[PDB]
Design a protein around this ligand. Structure first.
Ligand SMILES: Nc1ncnc2c1ncn2[C@@H]1O[C@H](COP(=O)(O)OP(=O)(O)O)[C@@H](O)[C@H]1O
Ligand SMILES: Nc1ncnc2c1ncn2[C@@H]1O[C@H](COP(=O)(O)OP(=O)(O)O)[C@@H](O)[C@H]1O
Ligand SMILES: [Mg+2]
Ligand SMILES: [Mg+2]
Ligand SMILES: [Mg+2]
Lengths: 575, 578
């Protein structure tokens, strides 16, 4: 009283599940036999045998796999999968024999079951026979002509012999299956169609993979493998073509946990324990080779699909990789993509930035923020942008960490535009021009440092990075910037709890002023005229607090800042 | 670790014995656990004991247990790579004789460096178990005394639930050293305070008293004895026994996640003994035991002295009590009574909800709160201005969980909660004041309509005369079921650090209620110049800046700091003479 006639949509999937289950039973007895010599005592062979029965209206799926004990026949046989057998039959008869127990039978009509002993005894040796009593409607599955194609379809990647009872012109078993694994075949003998059809066989339906790679590893260890990149955000391990496990969760590093595939080695031990084989020295050589072939796979993807598709899905993985993977860092560095001032939305690689650098530019400039808009509208990038330097914009929380794990790219050091180190060159006769303006505005500097912003600024200097903005707060090289304040301060608030007593944390920054900006020109002209004035003092403080938000730091006191604004607003209105 | 582990523990070198008894007990727990599903698991050696022999003559100290033992492969993994290396504090050479049920008897020898495992020439001596033999070093060769071990076992192996015997003298025969009866099985009244504390230290280290403990016995649906503890610090857990037999410490569902810091013992005589681990964890009686553990933990937490509760417990585990209010529906009332928050009543002191209620006005029915990233932000907010003046108390919520905590508690002792940053704040009003406000609202209508229809058109829901401001000119009030600045902040950070951009949200980018203060000089002046000339740009420009600043003051994010900086600039030029 559930499915039966709705999923149905996938009308003949019952066989796929019974063939799949039989293969799983076959894999399991084989796996045990590698440690237990007397495991294959009941049956020499490892097969799946399907028998058509017209007269009695029956269909048998017989496997010589592990089998099931009475206790297992109760739990395992219940509620695609085993139950899908009821999409074509109204009664399932499961005859099973296991090594540790005698032979039993199981019969359910989708509602109630019964686990009797077999009055015939041990007729299987070891394994199971799934007898389906077909419905009058789905009785077409008794036909030998149709059932042959039905197994040829759902067992293209089953690596155990599948036989069906047929005849010629003499009844006998016929192989419908080729058990030569797909990963063991010559690279170009395998069509692209087959690679995609293999991907859907173990990832349980869905669409094609984004990319794949099939290779024979050479050198210290030799193995065959087909790895896959999925479309949206499990490595099977075989030894000498014998399935071992898919539960070795550390086959790939955490940052590549999305890769799917098979590994098949002739150089690893077969008759050893699963624990033993997990710590084996050669396996680690396989793991390091999987990473490199995976990065080779990722690099083989075409430029547009790489940016618009791969990167959108796994970009955070490459960033986590850069930090976590020391050996493959340089390779991971080239796979990174970030938005830059070059274009309003296109993402750029680090190489592309490099090729665009000016002849005498030694630094890769970056601005970090919570969004594209705040990063690009920052005062810090004003003159760099005007002079034609490109600035990388980092908008994600991991970006900062990512670049920090990268001490250089292609000989160039990264420079945060919110910190000191932004280089602006000049000639001899150009150096004096600045130095004159620098000493002209020096009274305004000392006044800000010893009165207007006495213990609120580390120092005041004449900026060379601003064009439109009057001023900005710049942090020390070993200090925390605006964005890093957030990243750390909103994690010290979320998880940390009280983190203020730190040297380069909440420390005074360098207050830079724009000499060409009217509010600095007036402030200078007016500071040499009174100094005791609270008006310009209120101007210096309001400008400093505005510059703070502008620079990306929090305000120490919103009430004090508010009180100052409203006092100016009084002036602007009264006269 | 290497050879600099001896100097770090030169103080505590007598502890080597504790470490050998602890392991023997661990070995005995393991073999006894196997025997619950395996009938013939004790066929090699029937008893479960700890035997210690003094052999002065050969310079050897023997510690013979009858536990699980070690196989060939287990000797080359477990031994080598506090602990077992503790034996080297008193012995230069250490040899272990051992016998496991699956293997034959082997001898492991080492000094610290290389190791070698040989098949014992004598053969299967112990049936099962291990003998740790110490070649006691000269400068510590005094433990081979017929009374020194006698005294150490008695003071150290307290709480070991297996019989420990030393090869004494009187005729040489084994003399019992300890009492096998567990501390949790003894009647509450009889157990000493020191004994409870020493018990806490035995299974969790940390060498300091626990913050609190509870020793109870459960009657009714299920019976079990238990001792539960509150540690002193938040670490940055519960041993189950069935009929005095250790089963596991791997059940991570004994306590709900919010009480994960609780450590202790549960000894049940009702649970199935001769069954598997899988079977026992899913067992229906456990859910009954769990509910009892939570109620008893809460009893203990409630029993802590008022001063100690706020000063020590609340600082360590207040977040857990907050998550509890959200997750534990059947205990909500008990937990809500345990909450502590900062409030206006005092600069730093925290307060319970009962204490707040008692301080409420005779006709106040709402518990008012202000949420924010810090106390400074919350107390200097515009929203508490009037309430504070008129003597209402405002709870201050500064941790991100606090809002979800209050938002999960619909009422406390009949009083609903109200966020001052939202619509819903009330003030009892004398007939004189009520009418005075009515005249203020009609007088200020021209300023309210100008703001809503042109000056701030499309920025605000409506412009109204406030009842909550005092010193502040204006503020942004969110709707009854909308997001406060604090919720906007928490959601934006969760949509950035974890989420994948919630720009086009549900109610994050929504207009707020702009409340203006009629008694504020700047607003008074703003009314005068608007009626005189509505199309004056200087007042329109001012309106924007006042609003934008009000947005920072109201705890909201400003939508364009660049444009706002530039408007503040224009204002500064006009304010001065640029
Ligand atoms: N032919 C079989 N031989 C042995 N065991 C089987 C067989 N068919 C089913 N089982 C057991 O019962 C379970 C039922 O299969 P199914 O419903 O497909 O679940 P699964 O996805 O794990 O295979 C299997 O996991 C297996 O434990
Ligand atoms: N008496 C013993 N009987 C059996 N195994 C032991 C014994 N002593 C030590 N071992 C083995 O050595 C391991 C390490 O002991 P120790 O260093 O104290 O670590 P731990 O107490 O945390 O297990 C034990 O876990 C066990 O595998
Ligand atoms: Mg299945
Ligand atoms: Mg004021
Ligand atoms: Mg400007």
């Amino acid at each position: 009283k559930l499915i039966i006639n709705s999923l149905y949509k996938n009308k003949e999937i019952f066989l796929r599940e019974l063939i799949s289950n039989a293969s799983d039973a076959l894999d399991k007895i084989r796996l045990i036999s590698l440690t237990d010599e007397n495991a294959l005592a009941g049956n020499e062979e490892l097969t799946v045998k399907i028998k058509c029965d017209k007269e009695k209206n029956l269909l048998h799926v017989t496997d010589t796999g592990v089998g099931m004990t009475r206790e297992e026949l109760v739990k395992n046989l219940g509620t695609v999968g085993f139950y899908s057998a009821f999409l074509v039959a109204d009664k399932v008869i499961v005859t099973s024999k296991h090594n540790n127990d005698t032979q039993h039978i199981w019969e359910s009509d989708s509602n109630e079951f019964s686990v009797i002993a077999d009055p015939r005894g041990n007729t299987l040796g070891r394994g199971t026979t799934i007898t389906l009593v077909l419905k009058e409607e789905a009785s077409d599955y008794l036909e030998l002509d149709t059932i042959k194609n039905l197994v040829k379809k759902y067992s293209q990647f089953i690596n155990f012999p599948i036989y069906v009872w047929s005849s010629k012109t003499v009844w006998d078993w016929e192989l419908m299956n080729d058990i030569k694994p797909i990963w063991q075949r010559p690279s170009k003998e395998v069509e692209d169609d087959e690679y995609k059809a293999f991907y859907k066989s173990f990832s349980k339906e869905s669409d094609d993979p984004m990319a794949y790679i099939h290779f024979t590893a050479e050198g210290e260890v030799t193995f065959k493998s087909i790895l896959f990149v999925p479309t949206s955000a499990y490595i099977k391990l075989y030894v000498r073509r014998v399935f071992i496990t898919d539960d070795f969760h550390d086959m790939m590093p955490k940052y590549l946990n999305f890769v799917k595939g098979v590994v098949d080695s002739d150089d690893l031990p077969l008759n050893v324990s699963r624990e033993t084989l997990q710590q084996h020295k050669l396996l680690k050589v396989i793991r390091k080779k999987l990473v490199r072939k995976t990065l080779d796979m990722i690099k083989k993807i075409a430029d547009e699909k790489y940016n618009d598709t791969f990167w959108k899905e796994f970009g955070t993985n490459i960033k986590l990789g850069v930090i976590e993977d020391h050996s493959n860092r340089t390779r991971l560095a080239k796979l990174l993509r970030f938005q830059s001032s070059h274009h309003p939305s296109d993402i750029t690689s680090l190489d592309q930035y490099v090729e665009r650098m000016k002849e005498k530019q030694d630094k890769i400039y970056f601005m970090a923020g919570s969004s594209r808009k705040e990063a690009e509208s920052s005062p810090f990038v004003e003159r760099l942008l005007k002079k034609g330097y490109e600035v990388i914009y980092l908008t994600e929380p991991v970006d900062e960490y990512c670049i920090q794990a990268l001490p250089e790219f292609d000989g160039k050091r990264f420079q945060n535009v919110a910190k000191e180190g932004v280089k602006f060159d000049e000639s001899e006769k150009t150096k004096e021009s600045r130095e004159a303006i620098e000493k002209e505005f020096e009274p305004l500097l000392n006044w800000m440092k010893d009165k207007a912003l006495k213990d609120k600024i580390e120092k005041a200097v004449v900026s060379q990075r601003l064009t439109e903005s009057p001023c900005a707060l710049v942090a020390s090289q070993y200090g925390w910037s605006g964005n890093m304040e957030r990243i750390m301060k909103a994690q010290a608030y979320q998880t940390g709890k009280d983190i203020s007593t730190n040297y380069y944390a909440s420390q005074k920054k360098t207050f830079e002023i724009n000499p060409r900006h009217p509010l600095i020109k007036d402030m200078l002209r007016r500071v040499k005229e009174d100094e005791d004035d609270k008006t310009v003092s209120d101007l210096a403080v309001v400008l400093f607090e505005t510059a703070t938000l502008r620079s990306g730091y929090l305000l120490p006191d919103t009430k004090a800042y508010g009180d100052r604004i409203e006092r100016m607003l009084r002036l602007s209105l009264n006269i």
